[PDB]
DNA sequence: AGACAAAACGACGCGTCGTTTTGTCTCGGCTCCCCGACATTCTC
């Protein structure tokens, strides 16, 4: 049967019917976090 | 099996669209300039 999951999972590519592939990234690929921070002084973060 | 990626749980919790309702400084004395309108007389 087919379960459904409600998530963030992104396309694997563009051409042909790769557009209807949705993966989850791998394991040990979330490399780089981000910190900014706006001119008043909160820092703000991010996963690229 | 390991350890990363993220979904799931929590009560909690604070934000958010759409509309309605609410709240908004107050009175006293005078003086002296100007103008407007409406009545009378007088000149043209």
Same mark, same amino acid.
């Given at each position: !049967?087919? !379960? +459904?999951?409600?998530?963030? #999972? +992104?396309?694997?590519?563009?051409?042909?019917?790769?557009?209807?592939?949705?993966?989850?990234?791998? #394991?040990?690929?979330?490399? +780089? +976090?981000?910190?900014?921070?706006?001119? #008043?002084? #909160?820092?703000?973060?991010?996963?690229?």
């Amino acid at each position: !049967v087919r !379960v +459904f999951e409600l998530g963030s #999972k +992104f396309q694997v590519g563009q051409t042909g019917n790769k557009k209807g592939k949705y993966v989850e990234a791998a #394991k040990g690929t979330n490399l +780089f +976090f981000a910190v900014y921070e706006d001119e #008043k002084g #909160k820092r703000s973060y991010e996963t690229i």
